[PDB]
Amino acid sequence: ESHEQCIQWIVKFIHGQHSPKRISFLYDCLAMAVETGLLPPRLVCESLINSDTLEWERTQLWALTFKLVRKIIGGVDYKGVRDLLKVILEKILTIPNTVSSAVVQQLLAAREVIAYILERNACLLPAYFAVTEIRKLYPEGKLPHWLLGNLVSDFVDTFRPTARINSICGRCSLLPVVNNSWKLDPATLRFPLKGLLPYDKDLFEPQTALLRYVLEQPYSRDMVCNMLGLNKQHKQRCPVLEDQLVDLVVYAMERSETSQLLWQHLSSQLIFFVLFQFASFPHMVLSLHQKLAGRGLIKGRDHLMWVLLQFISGSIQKNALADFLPVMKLFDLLYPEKEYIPVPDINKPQSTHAFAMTCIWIHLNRKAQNDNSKLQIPIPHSLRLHHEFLQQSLRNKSLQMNDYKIALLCNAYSTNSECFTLPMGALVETIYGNGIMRIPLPGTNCMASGSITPLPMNLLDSLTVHAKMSLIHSIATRVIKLAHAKSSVALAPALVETYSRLLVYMEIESLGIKGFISQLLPTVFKSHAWGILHTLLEMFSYRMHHIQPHYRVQLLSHLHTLAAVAQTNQNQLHLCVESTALRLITALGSSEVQPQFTRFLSDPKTVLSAESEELNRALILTLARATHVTDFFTGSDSIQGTWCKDILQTIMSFTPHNWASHTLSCFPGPLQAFFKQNNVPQESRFNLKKNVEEEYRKWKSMSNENDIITHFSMQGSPPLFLCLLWKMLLETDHINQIGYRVLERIGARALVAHVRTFADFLVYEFSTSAGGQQLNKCIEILNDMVWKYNIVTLDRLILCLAMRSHEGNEAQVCYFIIQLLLLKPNDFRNRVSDFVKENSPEHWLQNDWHTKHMNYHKKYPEKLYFEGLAEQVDPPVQIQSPYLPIYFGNVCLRFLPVFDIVIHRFLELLPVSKSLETLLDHLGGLYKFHDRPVTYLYNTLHYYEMHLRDRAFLKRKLVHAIIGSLKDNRPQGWCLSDTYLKCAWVPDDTYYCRLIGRLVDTMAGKSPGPFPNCDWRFNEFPNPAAHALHVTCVELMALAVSGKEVGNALLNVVLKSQPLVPRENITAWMNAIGLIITALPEPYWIVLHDRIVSVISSPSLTSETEWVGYPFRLFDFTACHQSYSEMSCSYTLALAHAVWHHSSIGQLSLIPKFLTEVLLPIVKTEFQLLYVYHLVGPFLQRFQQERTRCMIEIGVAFYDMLLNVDQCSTHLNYMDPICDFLYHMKYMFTGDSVKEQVEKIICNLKPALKLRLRFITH
């Protein structure tokens, strides 16, 4: 209380005293009082500086006050000195630029006190606090105050080495592959930097190149939203995003001047941002008009008008007319001259593009007619032909489908109701088949509409977004009406194909794919149709390419509840649900399992199944593969604490099972530990044999009609009726009518358990049976039971065989059964040979698919209701169950996921490697119809690198069989390089240079292109970059060269003086190398540690040289003419930063162990210590967000290294940068966590270092 008042009174009396001598005397008395301890120095300093009467005008009074504070400022804690520095700088800032020359000499007192505070020898406060306040109150780009002078600039200049330590080399030139490192500030397009340090000038500018690259790539909508922080909560109205899209449009027109895919991508992309209120259409148009004005070069005018028409047609009703007026100004600038524009040729798709402006005028005029008067939009004088041609075409009653006139009418008259029913009717009646006769469908007693010709893809691309929404709404309404009507007539194949082709457009996501799962499927489910549901599920399985993971998981849950309830005890529906679920589980990505399963820990049973053990095992296999590829468990040896525990426990509580040793040995460690416990006892082979024999004897002794049916179909009895069947066919080779009746009453959902037990019974019987004639007889019986009698399907039988838990010889005979069943009979081989010969996988370019489908099904009919057994029973029984519509699938397409699983099991078991070669040779052509062959090859080689390490012939055979089976359907050079086709041998440096260069040119973007262009809407990869990365990885994996050699060669591409890799572009090569080596398995990217150790032991860092200044040249690769040693030292650091930038958190978890056990015992000099700080510095932020524990190890390792270097070295020349880095780390990342172990290390340091870091403990 009275301390502040008394000091203020004394100082104010001093202010009012006109005697400077008395002023000095009273200051001296106050100084003596502070010296003797009468008053707290912090309170005295605060009161003196915060005194209001103290003004710059009284120059002698100001100087004496600042002299007093300078004398007595040294007795304050560091936090106080920081606060007094804050208030002093605030007070100094009030000084104007120009002052009198007679008071300058007396105003230096502020400079004297600020210099004393900033002095490092005094160590009053940590220098990080001082630079933080200076940087906070002086932002980047502000000149220092003239009174302060160059002292502040030099002090800030002291911290650049720390800024370079905490910076990633070549960050602005690193680009990702679109599928927290790439986050940007929404307001300024700037990287989020930690702390207030003088970073490089390149980090203070927007990342326009990065944002443009992400925007240009297809399917980058979600990534852009994540990068810019758009939460989809309200109208963000992001100005930088709007400007980038406008510049992208300008650049597209620039390319158009002296491109169709880019224009389609723009029209497809910038619709979403405008529709979600992220950008404004009128503001976009005005900005585009202003930018394009005065430049000319007008050749992409038709494409730009096509882009604008999408909004003009799709949002005219829900927006005011005032927002679309500037389009007229855009026309005035973009279309010169007054001559009548000629009518283009209507036979080309570009005719729709050339009529875009006319359609815009029609929409605008119609919107003007609504709410008439006020304003009227007249016709331009140069659109008379375009208007008359449209009206004359409208007046025509008959319209043909050989031209694009109907597309022109739909695009122009999509708003007026009266002039739109006729073109819509003419467009939908060609696929609805309302008047034509009826066609047969595969199966028995199934008919559909006569339409077989769907709408062509190029015609669909010629329509507009609004027309496509109207078409898809009409199709959906007709489907719902048919579902409610309960009619036995199936939908037209043309309607189904057109719907599937329309569901690949992302602009209709509001009701295209969202309404397909949210509304249409539940409506058909409640309507109890079972015919449309089968059609939609088959459409999902065989005609869908790109679907978001959450939609896929949602349909997985819908499939599981559909199979669980609603009494879906039909063979066709049950098989369709099982096949769709198996494909959906298998096709899951590696980086999508955790984010899509983390939201279902509330009710895991929604996604997990209740009775399908095969589906549960498939989910477990996918989970193990994803966790292995993503390196999730690297660092943690316990499964508890992760999301997998709840899912695995729920699986074990639903379908308990065991795992084979060879299959379990490839699982990650936590999964192996989980399955070591939770082991379920299994049935004995003697017990199973005795039970089957006793039941079979009971079957002989029983003669009553009802007793057999009521006994062998009981629920809860052991599922061993298939074993009864098998035993009757090897004892008597005939089945009675009672057996057919039992099979009919068991049910599809109950026969699965019988198949499961039959597989184990089947394996045990071959194992204990004489080979030769008995083996040939017993495989002939199985062939008859599969094809001749139609008891079980081949795909389900092989899947159940491959999902068993046998060991050793039992596993060998189990896989030998699959071998014999697949190859020894001629049935499957003939079916696959025919299908591959006369079919093609490109379904989006075909028009006779139904005819080819009918031809195959007529040649090879499919039975799903025990038709063969029904006919072969001695009294011929007749079955008249209607067949659900079948449009796309067959046995060959259904077997594909089972064949992938079979390959994996054959790879797991060692003594059966020769069988896989024979399997691939005979049935390798079936991969022509695979959906993700390259991704499957990448996953298979990545997962089984250890097992395929010593077997290169099998690896090459697998790669060639999968890849070369599609060589007649894609352009040359799509996957493998020319050198590989001529050599496959030790690859040389040129091979790796060209391999990396292919990805570099693909990412850069070139007109010829290393890889051929493809329609990514119907491809497994969204962008060329992902395709290039995966094919490069697959080729490198298939190389018969050790992983260490491959990694060394890839590093040597940059780190050795080599042609074909020019300077001024080395960062792009480093980025490509980092991406490739990160995607490669562990033995490939482990050579980085060895290379770092080699540079650490280099004489460049080991030498006790007398360099003046900070050694900047060793850590920056963009330097002047460099010697070999310095060039290698800087290039290794840059390459390490590039690799670690693209690495996952599991891959980064090995750095603390590497520092602790490798670098620590060999770091003994200041240069090695600085090199380690440069290497591991910039990546502490990543550990802060995911793995907190690794921070503690890194911090103690750094202090241990500092202790070792201090003890070994006589003196240190760069104490200040080390001090600043440790202070920065403590105040930003680690904090107070490390205290006890820090004190022990600090106490043993030299007195100079102890004085420098006396504030770490506090």
Curated annotation (Swiss-Prot):
Cellular localisation: Nucleus
Organism of provenance: Homo sapiens
Transmembrane segments: none
The protein's role, per its UniProt record: Required for transcriptional activation subsequent to the assembly of the pre-initiation complex. Component of the Mediator complex, a coactivator involved in the regulated transcription of nearly all RNA polymerase II-dependent genes. Mediator functions as a bridge to convey information from gene-specific regulatory proteins to the basal RNA polymerase II transcription machinery.
GO biological process: positive regulation of gene expression; positive regulation of T cell extravasation; positive regulation of transcription elongation by RNA polymerase II; positive regulation of transcription initiation by RNA polymerase II; regulation of DNA-templated transcription; regulation of transcription by RNA polymerase II; RNA polymerase II preinitiation complex assembly; transcription initiation at RNA polymerase II promoter
Keyword field: Activator, Disease variant, Intellectual disability, Nucleus, Transcription, Transcription regulation
A Pfam short name: Med23
Disease with which this protein is associated in UniProt: Intellectual developmental disorder, autosomal recessive 18, with or without epilepsy: A disorder characterized by significantly below average general intellectual functioning associated with impairments in adaptive behavior and manifested during the developmental period.
Family as reported in the entry's similarity comment: Belongs to the Mediator complex subunit 23 family.
Name of this protein: Mediator of RNA polymerase II transcription subunit 23
Superkingdom per UniProt: Eukaryota
Subunit structure: Interacts with ELK1. Component of the Mediator complex, which is composed of MED1, MED4, MED6, MED7, MED8, MED9, MED10, MED11, MED12, MED13, MED13L, MED14, MED15, MED16, MED17, MED18, MED19, MED20, MED21, MED22, MED23, MED24, MED25, MED26, MED27, MED29, MED30, MED31, CCNC, CDK8 and CDC2L6/CDK11. The MED12, MED13, CCNC and CDK8 subunits form a distinct module termed the CDK8 module. Mediator containing the CDK8 module is less active than Mediator lacking this module in supporting transcriptional activation.
InterPro entries: Mediator_Med23
GO molecular function: transcription coactivator activity
Assigned GO CC terms: core mediator complex; mediator complex; nucleoplasm; nucleus; transcription regulator complex
